[PDB]
Write an enzyme that holds these catalytic residues in place. Structure first.
Site, PDB file in Angstrom:
ATOM      1  N   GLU A  60       0.797  -1.339  -0.128  1.00 40.25           N
ATOM      2  CA  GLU A  60      -0.047   0.108   0.053  1.00 40.25           C
ATOM      3  C   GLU A  60       0.794   1.290  -0.014  1.00 40.25           C
ATOM      4  O   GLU A  60       0.608   2.193  -0.935  1.00 40.25           O
ATOM      5  CB  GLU A  60      -1.008   0.011   1.464  1.00 40.25           C
ATOM      6  N   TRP A  82      -8.403  -2.280  -0.757  1.00 42.30           N
ATOM      7  CA  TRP A  82      -9.072  -1.282  -1.379  1.00 42.30           C
ATOM      8  C   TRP A  82     -10.215  -1.480  -2.454  1.00 42.30           C
ATOM      9  O   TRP A  82     -10.663  -0.669  -2.956  1.00 42.30           O
ATOM     10  CB  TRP A  82      -8.078  -0.037  -1.805  1.00 42.30           C
ATOM     11  N   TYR A 108      -5.258   9.861  -1.044  1.00 44.18           N
ATOM     12  CA  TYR A 108      -4.026   9.848  -0.981  1.00 44.18           C
ATOM     13  C   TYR A 108      -2.588  10.069  -1.802  1.00 44.18           C
ATOM     14  O   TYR A 108      -2.286  11.203  -1.824  1.00 44.18           O
ATOM     15  CB  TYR A 108      -3.548   8.406  -0.308  1.00 44.18           C
ATOM     16  N   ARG A 149       7.682  23.825   9.496  1.00 45.44           N
ATOM     17  CA  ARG A 149       6.769  23.539   8.615  1.00 45.44           C
ATOM     18  C   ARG A 149       6.691  22.447   7.605  1.00 45.44           C
ATOM     19  O   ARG A 149       6.395  22.319   6.581  1.00 45.44           O
ATOM     20  CB  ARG A 149       6.644  24.987   7.587  1.00 45.44           C
ATOM     21  N   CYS A 168      -8.201   9.259   6.072  1.00 45.39           N
ATOM     22  CA  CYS A 168      -8.649   9.148   7.495  1.00 45.39           C
ATOM     23  C   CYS A 168      -7.373   9.382   8.055  1.00 45.39           C
ATOM     24  O   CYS A 168      -7.341  10.244   9.248  1.00 45.39           O
ATOM     25  CB  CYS A 168      -9.007   7.469   7.485  1.00 45.39           C
ATOM     26  N   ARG A 188      -8.209  11.841  11.747  1.00 40.73           N
ATOM     27  CA  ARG A 188      -9.355  12.247  11.945  1.00 40.73           C
ATOM     28  C   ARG A 188     -10.235  10.960  12.373  1.00 40.73           C
ATOM     29  O   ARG A 188     -11.280  11.021  13.129  1.00 40.73           O
ATOM     30  CB  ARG A 188     -10.134  13.031  10.864  1.00 40.73           C
ATOM     31  N   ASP A 191     -10.538   3.329  12.826  1.00 40.44           N
ATOM     32  CA  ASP A 191     -11.202   1.848  12.838  1.00 40.44           C
ATOM     33  C   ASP A 191      -9.924   1.059  13.679  1.00 40.44           C
ATOM     34  O   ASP A 191      -9.299   0.362  13.154  1.00 40.44           O
ATOM     35  CB  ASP A 191     -11.361   1.262  11.613  1.00 40.44           C
ATOM     36  N   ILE A 230     -14.910   1.946  17.699  1.00 42.76           N
ATOM     37  CA  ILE A 230     -14.759   0.363  17.916  1.00 42.76           C
ATOM     38  C   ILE A 230     -16.116  -0.051  16.989  1.00 42.76           C
ATOM     39  O   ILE A 230     -16.983   0.007  17.906  1.00 42.76           O
ATOM     40  CB  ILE A 230     -14.381  -0.305  19.133  1.00 42.76           C
TER      41      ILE A 230
HETATM   42  N1  LIG Z   1     -14.676   1.033   7.645  1.00 44.67           N
HETATM   43  C1  LIG Z   1     -13.338   0.972   7.054  1.00 44.67           C
HETATM   44  N2  LIG Z   1     -12.398   0.759   7.729  1.00 44.67           N
HETATM   45  C2  LIG Z   1     -11.122   0.701   7.255  1.00 44.67           C
HETATM   46  O1  LIG Z   1     -10.049   0.409   8.115  1.00 44.67           O
HETATM   47  C3  LIG Z   1     -10.789   1.036   6.117  1.00 44.67           C
HETATM   48  C4  LIG Z   1      -9.883   1.269   5.071  1.00 44.67           C
HETATM   49  C5  LIG Z   1      -8.351   0.787   5.423  1.00 44.67           C
HETATM   50  C6  LIG Z   1      -7.843  -0.446   4.641  1.00 44.67           C
HETATM   51  C7  LIG Z   1      -7.802  -1.909   5.106  1.00 44.67           C
HETATM   52  C8  LIG Z   1      -9.175  -2.590   4.905  1.00 44.67           C
HETATM   53  C9  LIG Z   1      -9.221  -3.964   5.396  1.00 44.67           C
HETATM   54  C10 LIG Z   1      -8.131  -4.497   6.078  1.00 44.67           C
HETATM   55  C11 LIG Z   1      -8.448  -5.925   6.808  1.00 44.67           C
HETATM   56  O2  LIG Z   1      -9.586  -6.427   6.500  1.00 44.67           O
HETATM   57  N3  LIG Z   1      -7.536  -6.351   7.350  1.00 44.67           N
HETATM   58  C12 LIG Z   1      -7.456  -7.937   7.935  1.00 44.67           C
HETATM   59  C13 LIG Z   1      -6.604  -8.863   7.140  1.00 44.67           C
HETATM   60  C14 LIG Z   1      -7.129  -8.935   5.493  1.00 44.67           C
HETATM   61  C15 LIG Z   1      -6.500 -10.099   4.501  1.00 44.67           C
HETATM   62  O3  LIG Z   1      -5.968 -10.941   5.266  1.00 44.67           O
HETATM   63  O4  LIG Z   1      -6.351  -9.957   3.609  1.00 44.67           O
HETATM   64  C16 LIG Z   1      -7.065  -7.803   9.524  1.00 44.67           C
HETATM   65  O5  LIG Z   1      -7.513  -8.369  10.140  1.00 44.67           O
HETATM   66  O6  LIG Z   1      -6.026  -7.197   9.686  1.00 44.67           O
HETATM   67  C17 LIG Z   1      -7.033  -3.765   6.310  1.00 44.67           C
HETATM   68  C18 LIG Z   1      -6.861  -2.064   6.028  1.00 44.67           C
HETATM   69  C19 LIG Z   1     -10.266   1.462   3.687  1.00 44.67           C
HETATM   70  N4  LIG Z   1     -11.763   1.560   3.999  1.00 44.67           N
HETATM   71  C20 LIG Z   1     -12.140   1.300   5.050  1.00 44.67           C
HETATM   72  N5  LIG Z   1     -13.469   1.349   5.659  1.00 44.67           N
HETATM   73  C1  LIG Z   2     -10.197   5.272   6.818  1.00 42.22           C
HETATM   74  C2  LIG Z   2      -8.923   4.877   5.985  1.00 42.22           C
HETATM   75  C3  LIG Z   2      -7.538   4.368   6.913  1.00 42.22           C
HETATM   76  O1  LIG Z   2      -6.490   4.368   6.240  1.00 42.22           O
HETATM   77  N1  LIG Z   2      -7.622   4.107   8.097  1.00 42.22           N
HETATM   78  C4  LIG Z   2      -9.019   3.962   8.813  1.00 42.22           C
HETATM   79  O2  LIG Z   2      -8.961   3.577   9.930  1.00 42.22           O
HETATM   80  N2  LIG Z   2     -10.163   4.294   8.040  1.00 42.22           N
HETATM   81  C5  LIG Z   2     -11.377   4.032   8.641  1.00 42.22           C
HETATM   82  C6  LIG Z   2     -11.920   5.349   9.474  1.00 42.22           C
HETATM   83  C7  LIG Z   2     -13.495   5.201   9.455  1.00 42.22           C
HETATM   84  O3  LIG Z   2     -13.854   3.808  10.285  1.00 42.22           O
HETATM   85  C8  LIG Z   2     -13.793   4.704   8.213  1.00 42.22           C
HETATM   86  C9  LIG Z   2     -14.088   5.800   7.233  1.00 42.22           C
HETATM   87  O4  LIG Z   2     -15.263   6.182   7.593  1.00 42.22           O
HETATM   88  P1  LIG Z   2     -15.576   7.831   7.700  1.00 42.22           P
HETATM   89  O5  LIG Z   2     -15.599   8.295   6.320  1.00 42.22           O
HETATM   90  O6  LIG Z   2     -14.715   8.407   8.406  1.00 42.22           O
HETATM   91  O7  LIG Z   2     -17.213   8.091   7.748  1.00 42.22           O
HETATM   92  O8  LIG Z   2     -12.598   3.865   7.801  1.00 42.22           O
HETATM   93  C1  LIG Z   3       1.923  31.441  14.914  1.00 46.10           C
HETATM   94  C2  LIG Z   3       0.549  31.949  14.804  1.00 46.10           C
HETATM   95  C3  LIG Z   3      -0.316  31.665  15.970  1.00 46.10           C
HETATM   96  O1  LIG Z   3      -1.546  31.912  15.706  1.00 46.10           O
HETATM   97  N1  LIG Z   3       0.191  31.133  17.073  1.00 46.10           N
HETATM   98  C4  LIG Z   3       1.436  30.988  17.436  1.00 46.10           C
HETATM   99  O2  LIG Z   3       1.831  30.330  18.331  1.00 46.10           O
HETATM  100  N2  LIG Z   3       2.442  31.170  16.211  1.00 46.10           N
HETATM  101  C5  LIG Z   3       3.748  31.094  16.603  1.00 46.10           C
HETATM  102  C6  LIG Z   3       4.442  29.774  16.181  1.00 46.10           C
HETATM  103  C7  LIG Z   3       5.854  30.191  15.939  1.00 46.10           C
HETATM  104  O3  LIG Z   3       6.231  30.514  17.276  1.00 46.10           O
HETATM  105  C8  LIG Z   3       5.853  31.465  15.283  1.00 46.10           C
HETATM  106  C9  LIG Z   3       5.665  31.130  13.688  1.00 46.10           C
HETATM  107  O4  LIG Z   3       6.844  30.418  13.497  1.00 46.10           O
HETATM  108  P1  LIG Z   3       7.189  29.523  12.356  1.00 46.10           P
HETATM  109  O5  LIG Z   3       6.533  29.937  10.920  1.00 46.10           O
HETATM  110  O6  LIG Z   3       6.357  28.331  12.902  1.00 46.10           O
HETATM  111  O7  LIG Z   3       8.761  29.432  11.945  1.00 46.10           O
HETATM  112  O8  LIG Z   3       4.560  31.952  15.584  1.00 46.10           O
END
Ligand SMILES: Nc1nc(=O)c2c(CCc3ccc(C(=O)N[C@@H](CCC(=O)O)C(=O)O)cc3)c[nH]c2[nH]1
Ligand SMILES: *c1cc(=O)[nH]c(=O)n1[C@H]1C[C@H](O)[C@@H](COP(=O)(O)O)O1
Ligand SMILES: *c1cc(=O)[nH]c(=O)n1[C@H]1C[C@H](O)[C@@H](COP(=O)(O)O)O1
Ligand SMILES: Nc1nc(=O)c2c(CCc3ccc(C(=O)N[C@@H](CCC(=O)O)C(=O)O)cc3)c[nH]c2[nH]1
Lengths: 286, 286
Positions: A60, A82, A108, A149, A168, A188, A191, A230
């Protein structure tokens, strides 16, 4: 051990989380704002209380750096993770009924390398156009390490409506102090049973890769969650995994010096010392 | 108390931070990745161990929502906090020698309301064009509370080179559970002595404002830091403030029901119970 933080976050989301609803219609216990810190010095955060599909992890990331968006390409290598959100059904339900299967949209990869770029079809040539964050980041570490930055951002408001499933892991930032490179992630949405474990490994790997090309020593991987949930149909499973003893985190090696983040091949990486507890199956919420 | 977390973060950055350099040429002790959580239920996080310029806080936020970028406008109200990076000198040093004083560039306000938009001069009409995150966020809280994508992002890679000083508060996300609205912030860079205190209050206020228009009760304000530093010439001062007893956080009231985030006026807000310890002067690093 370091895997205890993860376990604990799961332990918490279970004894203090709150019932919530979500788009999948499935259930969910959630908590808002959480932060864990994994050490990358002489060890790789590949969970042990469960067996992680390291193959998919590595494929990936290689897939992202490539800037690809065809869920088919990754499928070709044998990583189905995916194919679900690229399917014909899932895509039609969002009004993308004129797209060809596997076109995840400006996600991504495309954001990392061609941010500015105007998307249009998963097989167009986007070279030269857009802004390459991944590279911009690398050159900064090399020339000006103290910069506050060094950010790579996937969240692009303008394109949200075209994405089949928003980032995510929306933003990450690197920081360097005394020869070592660290990285923090803002996820943000998390899962806790499927994606997170996969995500922690993907960023630790990316850090290793970066550190190698810039000649630094990996430091810390800081993981910051937003809606850490969860899914309800994961409670029984996770409840087992929670009763497992953790063995030492493995070690990852790069057997061949590479100087371009694009020269990396799957054969350049090898893991050593992985004695995970047997797998745990958990269904994906679509 | 809640002000102890802040104090503590300062206490830490002082006995475990590391010497670092920065663009200002000034010094700095820093730490990477930190997280504090302030409760917004029946109290406002306006620091007490020091006197905070609440006037500037309120004016600046009103200034942001407006979408303005003229550091002059805010100056007109009596809030100089942004005249420094808008000055003729500071602007010429970045090669913006053809801009008129006070043109900060595509920053905060402009990003919040006109993300897509193509910037060009601090006094052009950007209405209708660009994408309004601030509003998009509000309507979602109203119609679909469970959404895990209520994000407002200021970091816009394409525009970085035009900004006189990048977004320190780069991204925030809202989450709602059982009648209460919470908000988390990712601050890539934090000046622990000047900006942070100001920043904590600005987001707690924004949360209050949002909660009011959507009819919810404010919950938690989660603050996530990246490079949390302390300029060296701030050590003596902060060291005093650290020996001060904290009094109860004040209370903030909105004396008049408003239903549009743009209808807010400075007179709609009033604070009660603010007994801060005397001011502490600290010089700004330009
Ligand atoms: N709802 C939701 N959640 C997510 O995490 C997600 C993702 C992240 C990618 C992802 C999806 C499934 C598994 C997965 O199934 N992993 C398995 C193994 C599978 C295998 O053996 O091929 C595990 O148990 O880790 C591992 C990673 C994309 N869309 C999503 N939507
Ligand atoms: C999104 C992709 C990733 O790489 N990792 C994650 O955990 N996920 C999960 C977050 C959430 O469970 C779901 C996306 O749902 P939503 O768009 O936040 O509603 O995938
Ligand atoms: C930026 C603006 C704000 O609202 N709050 C903050 O603390 N700052 C500070 C962060 C850093 O001390 C400086 C910006 O420096 P740089 O761009 O990160 O190099 O202001
Ligand atoms: N390096 C750097 N750091 C920052 O924090 C920053 C900012 C944030 C805005 C800002 C600047 C100064 C004061 C401030 O001086 N506050 C005083 C009160 C001043 C008064 O009374 O008018 C304080 O002690 O809080 C308060 C807020 C913009 N550019 C910056 N650059």
């Amino acid at each position: 051990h370091g895997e205890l933080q993860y376990l604990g976050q799961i332990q918490h989301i279970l004894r203090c989380g709150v019932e919530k609803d979500d788009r999948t219609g499935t259930g969910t216990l959630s908590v808002f704002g959480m932060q864990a810190r994994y050490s990358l010095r002489d060890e790789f955060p590949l969970l042990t209380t469960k067996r992680v599909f390291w193959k998919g992890v590595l494929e990936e990331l290689l897939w992202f750096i490539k800037g690809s968006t065809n869920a088919k390409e990754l499928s070709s290598k044998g990583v189905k993770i995916w194919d679900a959100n690229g399917s014909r059904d899932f895509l039609d339900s969002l009004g993308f009924s004129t797209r060809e299967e596997g076109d995840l949209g400006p996600v991504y990869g495309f954001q990392w390398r061609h941010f500015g770029a105007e998307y249009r079809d998963m097989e167009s040539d986007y070279s030269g156009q857009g802004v390459d964050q991944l590279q911009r980041v690398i050159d900064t570490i090399k020339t000006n390490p103290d910069d506050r930055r060094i950010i790579m951002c996937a969240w692009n408001p303008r394109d949200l409506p075209l994405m089949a499933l928003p980032p995510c892991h929306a933003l990450c930032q690197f920081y360097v102090v005394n020869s070592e490179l660290s990285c923090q992630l803002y996820q943000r949405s998390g899962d806790m049973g499927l994606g997170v474990p996969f995500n922690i490994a993907s960023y630790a790997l990316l850090t290793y890769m970066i550190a190698h090309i810039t000649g630094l020593k990996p430091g810390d991987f800081i993981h910051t969650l937003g809606d850490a949930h969860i899914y309800l149909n994961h409670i029984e499973p996770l409840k087992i995994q929670l009763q497992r003893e953790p063995r030492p985190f493995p070690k990852l090696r790069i057997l061949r010096k590479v100087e371009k983040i694009d020269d990396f091949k799957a054969e350049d990486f090898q893991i050593e010392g992985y004695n995970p507890h047997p797998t745990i199956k958990m269904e994906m919420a679509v």
